[PDB]
């Protein structure tokens, strides 16, 4: 996992994550891509930190969108998006 | 290649001198070898940078500069930032 990767899986999803609505088709398969590289324990430290710097970077960050992200994809997320996650703690 | 694991296990042996000061030792020293050589695209290190992120914050009574002071005292020219402030998105 690198955080070039993660930024690749959720780009598709900047859309709904800043403007609300739903995420998609796209984001969701980028979701679940990044999930999928999210198994081992390390890998998914790895994928939380670099998730943190990314729900960081995107301009007007909307709470409901990214809590609701995983149930409109259907997908036990191993990582939420958050901006403030202690990745410790996955 | 780096993980946060990798990063974490590296810098263990540094905790005593990047929370109470005095030199790194050369467990520590070592770690951060490993560190250096490991980051080696620019992907590898905005991802190391992020770990050593949650790392640096993590560590109870963090010095930031002995933190920022590691690398010359181990002789080493580490190509990312320990930072507990650092955005990653910023290195090169």
Avoid: H, M, W
Avoid at 53 to 61: D, E, G, V
């Amino acid at each position: 996992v690198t955080c070039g990767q993660v930024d690749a899986n959720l780009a598709p999803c900047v859309p709904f994550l800043t403007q609300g609505g739903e995420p998609g088709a796209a984001c969701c398969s980028g979701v679940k891509t990044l999930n999928g590289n999210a198994q081992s324990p390390d890998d998914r430290k790895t994928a939380c930190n670099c998730i943190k710097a990314a729900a960081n970077r995107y301009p007007n960050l909307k709470d409901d969108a990214a809590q609701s992200l995983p149930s409109k994809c259907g997908i036990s997320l191993n990582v939420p998006i958050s901006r403030t996650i202690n990745c410790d703690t996955i």
